[PDB]
Tab-separated table of C-alpha atoms and ligand atoms in Angstrom:
chain	number	residue	atom	x	y	z
A	1	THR	CA	93.429	130.804	188.691
A	2	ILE	CA	96.721	132.721	188.865
A	3	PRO	CA	98.292	133.476	185.461
A	4	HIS	CA	101.778	132.090	184.871
A	5	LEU	CA	104.252	134.143	182.837
A	6	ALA	CA	107.742	133.367	181.547
A	7	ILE	CA	108.720	137.050	181.719
A	8	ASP	CA	112.136	137.401	183.350
A	9	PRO	CA	112.067	140.775	185.179
A	10	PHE	CA	115.835	140.450	185.752
A	11	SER	CA	116.981	139.974	182.147
A	12	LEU	CA	118.894	142.580	180.171
A	13	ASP	CA	116.079	142.825	177.615
A	14	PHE	CA	113.707	143.638	180.480
A	15	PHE	CA	116.078	146.311	181.803
A	16	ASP	CA	116.371	147.930	178.363
A	17	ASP	CA	112.594	148.408	178.060
A	18	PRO	CA	110.569	147.193	181.060
A	19	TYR	CA	107.364	149.132	180.341
A	20	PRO	CA	105.714	146.827	177.749
A	21	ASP	CA	106.264	143.797	179.989
A	22	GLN	CA	105.152	145.713	183.093
A	23	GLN	CA	101.764	146.319	181.470
A	24	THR	CA	101.635	142.614	180.611
A	25	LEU	CA	102.293	141.913	184.297
A	26	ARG	CA	99.657	144.431	185.414
A	27	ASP	CA	96.851	143.467	183.029
A	28	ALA	CA	97.403	139.711	183.414
A	29	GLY	CA	95.860	139.962	186.882
A	30	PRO	CA	96.305	141.431	190.359
A	31	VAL	CA	98.713	138.597	191.242
A	32	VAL	CA	100.930	136.684	188.808
A	33	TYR	CA	103.345	133.764	189.076
A	34	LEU	CA	106.752	134.069	187.395
A	35	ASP	CA	107.819	130.581	186.302
A	36	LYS	CA	111.400	131.730	185.649
A	37	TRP	CA	112.161	132.167	189.366
A	38	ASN	CA	109.171	130.441	191.057
A	39	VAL	CA	107.869	133.616	192.712
A	40	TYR	CA	104.579	135.453	193.001
A	41	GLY	CA	104.389	138.898	191.441
A	42	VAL	CA	102.265	141.989	191.998
A	43	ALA	CA	102.550	144.886	189.547
A	44	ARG	CA	99.435	147.032	190.027
A	45	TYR	CA	99.527	149.922	192.482
A	46	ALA	CA	96.837	148.504	194.776
A	47	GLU	CA	98.478	145.145	195.502
A	48	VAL	CA	101.999	146.581	195.771
A	49	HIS	CA	100.719	149.127	198.296
A	50	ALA	CA	98.794	146.474	200.240
A	51	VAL	CA	101.831	144.177	200.427
A	52	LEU	CA	104.052	147.035	201.620
A	53	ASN	CA	101.575	147.932	204.394
A	54	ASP	CA	101.152	144.317	205.597
A	55	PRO	CA	104.507	143.597	207.273
A	56	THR	CA	103.201	140.849	209.573
A	57	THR	CA	102.142	138.691	206.613
A	58	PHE	CA	104.680	139.893	204.009
A	59	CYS	CA	107.774	140.035	206.198
A	60	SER	CA	111.272	141.240	205.346
A	61	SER	CA	113.417	139.349	207.881
A	62	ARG	CA	113.576	136.333	205.547
A	63	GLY	CA	115.132	138.608	202.885
A	64	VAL	CA	113.921	141.418	200.620
A	65	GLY	CA	115.644	139.591	197.780
A	66	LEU	CA	114.926	136.375	195.946
A	67	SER	CA	116.952	134.303	198.405
A	68	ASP	CA	115.076	133.057	201.468
A	69	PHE	CA	117.191	133.643	204.577
A	70	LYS	CA	115.376	130.668	206.136
A	71	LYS	CA	116.617	128.502	203.227
A	72	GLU	CA	119.971	130.053	202.243
A	73	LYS	CA	122.509	131.975	204.262
A	74	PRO	CA	122.736	135.650	203.253
A	75	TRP	CA	125.770	136.805	201.302
A	76	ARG	CA	126.365	139.353	204.091
A	77	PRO	CA	125.114	139.691	207.680
A	78	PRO	CA	121.452	140.716	207.455
A	79	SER	CA	120.568	144.392	207.605
A	80	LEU	CA	119.232	145.351	211.029
A	81	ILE	CA	116.815	147.790	209.341
A	82	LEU	CA	115.994	146.579	205.822
A	83	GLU	CA	115.872	142.840	206.520
A	84	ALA	CA	114.147	142.924	209.913
A	85	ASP	CA	110.542	142.935	211.102
A	86	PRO	CA	108.840	144.663	214.034
A	87	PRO	CA	109.564	144.788	216.868
A	88	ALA	CA	113.249	144.084	216.142
A	89	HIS	CA	113.098	146.652	213.316
A	90	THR	CA	111.571	149.508	215.321
A	91	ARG	CA	114.480	150.772	217.431
A	92	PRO	CA	117.159	150.621	214.693
A	93	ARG	CA	114.597	152.469	212.566
A	94	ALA	CA	114.131	155.160	215.221
A	95	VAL	CA	117.896	155.715	215.454
A	96	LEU	CA	118.247	156.153	211.691
A	97	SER	CA	115.116	158.320	211.689
A	98	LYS	CA	116.737	160.677	214.208
A	99	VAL	CA	120.199	160.614	212.603
A	100	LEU	CA	118.556	161.649	209.308
A	101	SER	CA	115.879	163.753	211.016
A	102	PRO	CA	114.325	167.012	209.801
A	103	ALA	CA	116.499	168.715	212.429
A	104	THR	CA	119.569	167.184	210.764
A	105	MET	CA	118.882	168.506	207.263
A	106	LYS	CA	119.085	172.063	208.620
A	107	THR	CA	122.792	171.627	209.436
A	108	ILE	CA	123.725	170.383	205.949
A	109	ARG	CA	121.236	172.091	203.607
A	110	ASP	CA	123.360	175.143	202.780
A	111	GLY	CA	126.401	172.953	202.176
A	112	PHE	CA	124.227	170.648	200.085
A	113	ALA	CA	122.883	173.701	198.236
A	114	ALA	CA	126.197	175.517	197.734
A	115	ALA	CA	127.861	172.379	196.359
A	116	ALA	CA	124.980	171.925	193.916
A	117	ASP	CA	125.252	175.642	193.118
A	118	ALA	CA	128.986	175.068	192.523
A	119	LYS	CA	128.726	171.994	190.277
A	120	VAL	CA	126.258	173.447	187.750
A	121	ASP	CA	128.581	176.441	187.332
A	122	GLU	CA	131.555	174.111	186.850
A	123	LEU	CA	129.697	172.047	184.244
A	124	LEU	CA	128.409	175.191	182.512
A	125	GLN	CA	132.049	176.198	181.997
A	126	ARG	CA	132.558	172.905	180.123
A	127	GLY	CA	129.245	172.855	178.244
A	128	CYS	CA	129.232	169.284	176.929
A	129	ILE	CA	129.356	167.006	179.982
A	130	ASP	CA	128.259	163.546	181.088
A	131	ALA	CA	125.150	164.018	183.226
A	132	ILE	CA	125.855	160.703	185.000
A	133	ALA	CA	129.580	160.689	185.767
A	134	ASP	CA	130.047	164.464	186.048
A	135	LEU	CA	126.704	165.302	187.703
A	136	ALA	CA	124.557	162.375	188.846
A	137	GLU	CA	127.654	160.755	190.386
A	138	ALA	CA	129.968	163.728	190.934
A	139	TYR	CA	127.551	165.814	193.013
A	140	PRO	CA	126.431	163.192	195.598
A	141	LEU	CA	130.013	161.927	195.914
A	142	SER	CA	131.089	165.499	196.701
A	143	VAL	CA	128.399	165.791	199.387
A	144	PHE	CA	127.231	162.507	200.908
A	145	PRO	CA	130.534	160.841	201.960
A	146	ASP	CA	131.536	164.025	203.799
A	147	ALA	CA	128.111	164.260	205.447
A	148	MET	CA	128.545	160.656	206.591
A	149	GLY	CA	131.927	161.605	208.061
A	150	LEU	CA	133.978	159.353	205.786
A	151	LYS	CA	137.707	159.325	205.210
A	152	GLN	CA	139.000	160.237	201.756
A	153	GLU	CA	141.112	157.137	201.062
A	154	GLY	CA	139.270	154.215	199.487
A	155	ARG	CA	136.198	156.242	198.513
A	156	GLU	CA	136.095	154.563	195.075
A	157	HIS	CA	134.660	151.449	196.780
A	158	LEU	CA	131.202	152.746	197.731
A	159	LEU	CA	129.569	152.883	194.292
A	160	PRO	CA	130.844	149.361	193.439
A	161	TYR	CA	129.623	148.246	196.870
A	162	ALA	CA	126.280	150.027	196.469
A	163	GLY	CA	125.762	148.505	193.026
A	164	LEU	CA	126.651	145.075	194.402
A	165	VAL	CA	124.174	145.265	197.300
A	166	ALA	CA	121.284	146.011	194.943
A	167	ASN	CA	122.527	143.355	192.512
A	168	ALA	CA	122.489	140.728	195.276
A	169	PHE	CA	118.754	141.160	195.900
A	170	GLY	CA	118.203	139.675	192.447
A	171	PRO	CA	118.172	136.071	191.312
A	172	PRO	CA	121.346	133.996	190.879
A	173	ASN	CA	121.900	135.333	187.365
A	174	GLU	CA	125.284	136.461	186.035
A	175	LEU	CA	124.714	140.025	187.276
A	176	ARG	CA	124.470	138.681	190.827
A	177	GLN	CA	127.228	136.064	190.543
A	178	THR	CA	129.614	138.530	188.886
A	179	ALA	CA	128.923	141.140	191.576
A	180	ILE	CA	129.474	138.839	194.575
A	181	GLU	CA	132.606	137.556	192.815
A	182	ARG	CA	134.108	141.071	193.040
A	183	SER	CA	132.925	141.713	196.602
A	184	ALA	CA	135.627	141.060	199.212
A	185	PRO	CA	137.647	144.282	198.608
A	186	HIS	CA	134.470	146.385	198.621
A	187	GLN	CA	133.111	144.640	201.729
A	188	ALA	CA	136.367	145.010	203.675
A	189	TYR	CA	136.504	148.784	203.179
A	190	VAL	CA	132.797	149.309	203.895
A	191	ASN	CA	132.907	147.238	207.085
A	192	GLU	CA	136.119	149.071	207.999
A	193	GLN	CA	134.447	152.491	207.682
A	194	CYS	CA	131.606	151.376	209.969
A	195	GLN	CA	133.752	151.264	213.114
A	196	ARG	CA	133.562	154.280	215.400
A	197	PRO	CA	137.227	155.454	215.115
A	198	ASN	CA	136.885	155.893	211.329
A	199	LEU	CA	133.929	158.324	211.445
A	200	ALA	CA	134.405	162.083	211.590
A	201	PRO	CA	132.644	163.727	214.562
A	202	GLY	CA	129.363	165.330	213.555
A	203	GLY	CA	128.791	163.076	210.552
A	204	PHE	CA	125.948	160.624	210.095
A	205	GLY	CA	128.005	157.621	211.195
A	206	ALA	CA	129.313	159.321	214.332
A	207	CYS	CA	125.743	160.243	215.275
A	208	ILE	CA	124.709	156.593	214.876
A	209	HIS	CA	127.425	155.419	217.271
A	210	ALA	CA	126.393	158.197	219.661
A	211	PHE	CA	122.930	156.588	219.662
A	212	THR	CA	124.353	153.578	221.526
A	213	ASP	CA	124.052	155.377	224.875
A	214	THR	CA	120.263	155.687	224.442
A	215	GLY	CA	119.814	151.910	224.667
A	216	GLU	CA	117.889	151.818	221.402
A	217	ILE	CA	120.872	150.087	219.768
A	218	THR	CA	123.959	148.462	221.237
A	219	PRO	CA	127.543	149.338	220.239
A	220	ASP	CA	127.676	146.087	218.254
A	221	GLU	CA	124.606	147.195	216.263
A	222	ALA	CA	125.940	150.608	215.223
A	223	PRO	CA	128.419	149.329	212.556
A	224	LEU	CA	125.584	147.501	210.782
A	225	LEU	CA	123.406	150.625	210.869
A	226	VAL	CA	126.312	152.592	209.391
A	227	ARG	CA	126.613	149.863	206.744
A	228	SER	CA	122.970	150.441	205.780
A	229	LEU	CA	123.623	154.056	204.781
A	230	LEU	CA	126.833	153.091	202.971
A	231	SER	CA	124.800	150.550	200.974
A	232	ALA	CA	121.762	152.730	200.228
A	233	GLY	CA	122.744	156.374	200.698
A	234	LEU	CA	124.480	157.063	197.378
A	235	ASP	CA	123.579	155.056	194.271
A	236	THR	CA	119.816	155.632	194.509
A	237	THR	CA	120.359	159.388	194.729
A	238	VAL	CA	122.713	159.057	191.747
A	239	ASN	CA	120.011	157.305	189.723
A	240	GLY	CA	117.357	159.677	191.063
A	241	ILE	CA	119.256	162.824	190.091
A	242	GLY	CA	120.326	161.229	186.810
A	243	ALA	CA	116.648	160.503	186.172
A	244	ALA	CA	115.526	164.103	186.704
A	245	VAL	CA	118.193	165.396	184.309
A	246	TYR	CA	117.141	162.902	181.632
A	247	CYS	CA	113.456	163.700	182.170
A	248	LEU	CA	114.195	167.421	181.883
A	249	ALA	CA	116.302	166.637	178.797
A	250	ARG	CA	113.477	164.857	176.936
A	251	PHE	CA	110.645	166.947	178.399
A	252	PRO	CA	111.881	170.477	177.586
A	253	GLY	CA	108.459	171.912	178.398
A	254	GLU	CA	108.863	170.666	181.963
A	255	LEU	CA	112.329	172.233	182.089
A	256	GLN	CA	110.884	175.605	181.074
A	257	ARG	CA	108.178	175.411	183.746
A	258	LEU	CA	110.828	174.570	186.345
A	259	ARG	CA	112.840	177.577	185.149
A	260	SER	CA	109.874	179.922	185.607
A	261	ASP	CA	109.126	178.577	189.115
A	262	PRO	CA	112.236	177.108	190.775
A	263	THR	CA	110.156	176.271	193.868
A	264	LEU	CA	108.852	173.310	191.826
A	265	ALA	CA	112.311	171.715	192.120
A	266	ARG	CA	111.459	169.466	195.074
A	267	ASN	CA	108.311	168.043	193.483
A	268	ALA	CA	110.144	167.861	190.147
A	269	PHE	CA	112.583	165.487	191.848
A	270	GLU	CA	109.713	163.602	193.496
A	271	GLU	CA	108.149	163.296	190.039
A	272	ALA	CA	111.419	161.929	188.654
A	273	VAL	CA	111.430	159.424	191.525
A	274	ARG	CA	107.949	158.194	190.600
A	275	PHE	CA	108.577	158.317	186.844
A	276	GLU	CA	111.787	156.275	186.760
A	277	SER	CA	111.689	154.566	190.195
A	278	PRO	CA	115.430	154.181	190.928
A	279	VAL	CA	114.491	151.154	193.045
A	280	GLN	CA	112.507	148.954	190.668
A	281	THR	CA	111.729	145.828	192.698
A	282	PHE	CA	111.849	144.357	196.198
A	283	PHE	CA	110.761	141.018	197.641
A	284	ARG	CA	108.674	139.975	200.617
A	285	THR	CA	108.092	136.529	202.105
A	286	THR	CA	104.674	135.265	203.175
A	287	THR	CA	104.643	134.347	206.867
A	288	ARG	CA	101.268	132.620	206.424
A	289	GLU	CA	98.776	131.432	203.847
A	290	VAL	CA	97.344	134.714	202.554
A	291	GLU	CA	94.654	135.721	200.059
A	292	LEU	CA	95.561	138.591	197.734
A	293	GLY	CA	93.868	139.504	194.464
A	294	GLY	CA	91.770	136.347	194.568
A	295	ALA	CA	95.002	134.327	194.825
A	296	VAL	CA	95.824	132.213	197.883
A	297	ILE	CA	99.595	132.336	198.427
A	298	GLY	CA	101.084	129.727	200.739
A	299	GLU	CA	103.543	130.273	203.556
A	300	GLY	CA	107.216	130.772	202.783
A	301	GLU	CA	106.603	132.117	199.270
A	302	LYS	CA	108.562	134.966	197.693
A	303	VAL	CA	106.354	137.812	196.444
A	304	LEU	CA	107.973	140.253	194.017
A	305	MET	CA	106.853	143.888	194.173
A	306	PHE	CA	107.174	145.984	191.002
A	307	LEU	CA	107.583	149.480	192.427
A	308	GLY	CA	108.234	151.034	189.020
A	309	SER	CA	105.157	149.381	187.523
A	310	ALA	CA	103.058	150.550	190.476
A	311	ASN	CA	104.312	154.106	189.883
A	312	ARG	CA	103.032	153.805	186.284
A	313	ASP	CA	99.742	151.992	186.944
A	314	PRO	CA	96.945	153.774	185.014
A	315	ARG	CA	94.497	152.445	187.627
A	316	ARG	CA	96.070	154.993	190.002
A	317	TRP	CA	97.803	157.624	187.851
A	318	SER	CA	96.528	159.778	184.995
A	319	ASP	CA	99.014	159.864	182.112
A	320	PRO	CA	101.506	157.674	184.054
A	321	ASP	CA	103.966	157.708	181.134
A	322	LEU	CA	104.232	161.525	181.211
A	323	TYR	CA	106.687	163.547	183.302
A	324	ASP	CA	104.665	166.231	185.121
A	325	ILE	CA	106.453	168.405	187.684
A	326	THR	CA	103.088	169.631	189.031
A	327	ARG	CA	101.581	166.165	189.533
A	328	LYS	CA	100.320	165.256	192.994
A	329	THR	CA	103.023	162.633	193.575
A	330	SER	CA	101.825	161.823	197.107
A	331	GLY	CA	101.207	158.081	197.328
A	332	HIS	CA	103.930	156.836	194.974
A	333	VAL	CA	105.936	153.842	196.172
A	334	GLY	CA	109.291	154.976	194.813
A	335	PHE	CA	110.454	155.277	198.430
A	336	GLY	CA	108.357	152.311	199.543
A	337	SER	CA	105.389	152.495	201.875
A	338	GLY	CA	104.760	151.524	205.481
A	339	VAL	CA	107.148	150.878	208.359
A	340	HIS	CA	110.025	150.297	205.907
A	341	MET	CA	109.492	153.468	203.841
A	342	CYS	CA	112.895	154.954	203.025
A	343	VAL	CA	114.453	156.353	206.194
A	344	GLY	CA	116.794	158.501	204.095
A	345	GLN	CA	114.123	160.043	201.880
A	346	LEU	CA	114.840	163.480	203.360
A	347	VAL	CA	118.509	163.223	202.376
A	348	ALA	CA	117.582	162.123	198.849
A	349	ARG	CA	114.989	164.874	198.394
A	350	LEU	CA	117.436	167.471	199.735
A	351	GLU	CA	120.088	166.433	197.208
A	352	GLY	CA	117.536	166.274	194.401
A	353	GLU	CA	115.845	169.588	195.194
A	354	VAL	CA	118.953	171.768	195.473
A	355	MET	CA	120.334	170.271	192.250
A	356	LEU	CA	117.149	170.799	190.241
A	357	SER	CA	117.043	174.231	191.885
A	358	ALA	CA	120.550	175.050	190.643
A	359	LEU	CA	119.585	173.822	187.172
A	360	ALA	CA	116.352	175.838	187.280
A	361	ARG	CA	118.245	179.068	188.020
A	362	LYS	CA	121.340	178.630	185.824
A	363	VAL	CA	120.417	176.394	182.847
A	364	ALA	CA	118.300	177.329	179.829
A	365	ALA	CA	118.366	174.036	177.896
A	366	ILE	CA	119.600	170.455	178.306
A	367	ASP	CA	120.258	168.830	174.915
A	368	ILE	CA	121.284	165.185	174.624
A	369	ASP	CA	124.260	165.236	172.245
A	370	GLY	CA	125.749	161.768	172.598
A	371	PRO	CA	125.072	158.032	172.797
A	372	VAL	CA	122.890	157.309	175.824
A	373	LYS	CA	123.983	154.100	177.564
A	374	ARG	CA	122.003	152.280	180.252
A	375	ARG	CA	123.426	150.896	183.498
A	376	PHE	CA	122.129	147.389	184.197
A	377	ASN	CA	121.325	146.199	187.722
A	378	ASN	CA	118.979	143.595	189.185
A	379	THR	CA	117.183	146.138	191.393
A	380	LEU	CA	118.191	149.645	190.310
A	381	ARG	CA	117.221	151.480	187.136
A	382	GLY	CA	119.688	154.061	185.905
A	383	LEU	CA	121.845	155.320	183.043
A	384	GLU	CA	125.531	154.558	182.557
A	385	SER	CA	126.146	157.764	180.586
A	386	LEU	CA	123.999	160.764	179.616
A	387	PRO	CA	126.005	163.052	177.305
A	388	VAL	CA	124.230	166.422	177.400
A	389	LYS	CA	125.123	169.992	176.471
A	390	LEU	CA	124.036	172.609	179.010
A	391	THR	CA	123.019	176.061	177.787
A	392	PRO	CA	123.641	178.753	180.430
A	393	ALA	CA	120.608	180.803	181.427
B	1	HEM	C1	116.258	158.484	195.177
B	1	HEM	C2	116.739	158.044	196.345
B	1	HEM	C3	116.239	156.782	197.098
B	1	HEM	C4	115.319	155.865	196.734
B	1	HEM	C5	114.478	155.788	195.438
B	1	HEM	C6	115.222	154.886	197.799
B	1	HEM	C7	114.395	153.782	197.818
B	1	HEM	C8	114.074	153.042	198.936
B	1	HEM	C9	112.984	152.095	199.060
B	1	HEM	C10	111.969	151.734	197.954
B	1	HEM	C11	113.007	151.589	200.296
B	1	HEM	C12	112.020	150.541	200.856
B	1	HEM	C13	112.721	149.200	201.052
B	1	HEM	C14	111.714	148.170	201.491
B	1	HEM	O1	110.555	148.555	201.796
B	1	HEM	O2	112.066	146.963	201.530
B	1	HEM	C15	114.118	152.193	201.007
B	1	HEM	C16	114.496	151.949	202.310
B	1	HEM	C17	115.670	152.382	202.890
B	1	HEM	N1	116.490	153.380	202.400
B	1	HEM	FE1	116.257	154.374	200.630
B	1	HEM	N2	116.102	155.247	198.798
B	1	HEM	C18	116.742	156.403	198.406
B	1	HEM	C19	117.698	157.074	199.142
B	1	HEM	C20	118.212	156.671	200.358
B	1	HEM	C21	119.147	157.410	201.183
B	1	HEM	C22	119.707	158.797	200.789
B	1	HEM	C23	119.400	156.677	202.287
B	1	HEM	C24	120.321	156.981	203.498
B	1	HEM	C25	121.047	158.094	203.652
B	1	HEM	C26	118.628	155.451	202.183
B	1	HEM	C27	118.598	154.421	203.103
B	1	HEM	C28	117.565	153.519	203.257
B	1	HEM	C29	117.399	152.555	204.331
B	1	HEM	C30	118.357	152.345	205.524
B	1	HEM	C31	116.268	151.878	204.110
B	1	HEM	C32	115.689	150.756	204.997
B	1	HEM	C33	114.490	151.331	205.748
B	1	HEM	C34	113.735	150.240	206.460
B	1	HEM	O3	113.963	149.044	206.148
B	1	HEM	O4	112.911	150.568	207.351
B	1	HEM	N3	117.919	155.486	201.000
B	1	HEM	N4	114.742	153.074	200.145
B	2	4MI	C1	118.400	149.388	197.622
B	2	4MI	S1	117.528	150.018	199.084
B	2	4MI	C2	118.446	149.534	200.574
B	2	4MI	C3	119.615	148.802	200.449
B	2	4MI	C4	120.321	148.429	201.579
B	2	4MI	C5	119.859	148.790	202.832
B	2	4MI	C6	120.638	148.376	204.077
B	2	4MI	O1	121.872	148.136	203.996
B	2	4MI	O2	120.045	148.274	205.182
B	2	4MI	C7	118.690	149.523	202.958
B	2	4MI	C8	117.984	149.896	201.829
């Protein structure tokens, strides 16, 4: 009944060009079985959205990766927020929701905006730059670690740690085994910068530890909640901003519309989030025998969600392969959906908006003038280098 496919969604050939295989996964049926890793797969928008909004049946406490926490021990202590189910997930979620609240973005927006308005000017003085290293990475690194309240020493560990966390959700391929092999130095620093004495007052991490008084989390739970933002608060914004620049580089008509109306910058970033989906996949584990798409999945089965394929499903989106800064992006699962929907989506949209805003007001053209190289990861889509030449407006 369920179609079986040998497609490896975690191979380098799949990362180079996932779109042909993602249509094969979508059109093969609402639910597929991937013989390479013995998992169920959903690639259409409807099933991916239904799985995300059914946390009781498709839980996350047994791991959002391939590995079953009930069968294998996790490579690191489980996330109190990402790898937990209600009700144990609720209160750590509420703390991170208030630390990254709408009232919090007001205190950092101008600093977020001025730094974006300072980087575009710096890169315009150089002309030919790398949109990944000198923009997609340089801008969030100049903004997010300080907003977290981080020290300056050892800051070159976060991006290797962030890339390793996303790589560990994948199967035991080389990408995962090579990552975890180079882990202990990155883990030691990250865990070190989760303790209360190492967080600057007023930063995100200090606010998390302040939320131990409220009784929603204990002091022993705050370092893990700080570790969640150190694992997820940087590299997805890097790939998200690096996606918008690439999309504006190959869709020059969309760049010119953004120039004429800079207020489209926020939705232009939301469109780049749907179009590229910096988080490609995430797992769930069936807590019961469940029927989905005419397929009866047993208990304790890993179900793979293709968030990028769901953001390009023609059953839900018109012209899903086109970058449209005026598209009604509401409903896309680039940030997830349900009780686990990205708690730091306001921080990511703030960084993406003010950067596309600075580009909309100061850049006239973005021309790719160098070899474009992709960055391979089991969970994250993103470019290693994007050599572009910026024309000042
Ligand atoms: C373009 C930027 C980003 C993208 C595409 C993204 C993507 C996602 C997705 C798809 C999920 C759902 C995970 C799941 O349902 O299993 C998620 C959750 C999460 N994200 Fe993000 N994220 C981004 C930025 C951020 C930022 C800036 C932060 C923190 C400052 C962050 C922290 C988290 C955390 C802690 C969770 C777990 C929420 C929960 O389990 O309830 N992410 N993210
Ligand atoms: C790649 S999305 C993500 C990664 C890690 C965490 C966490 O550390 O809790 C949350 C979201």
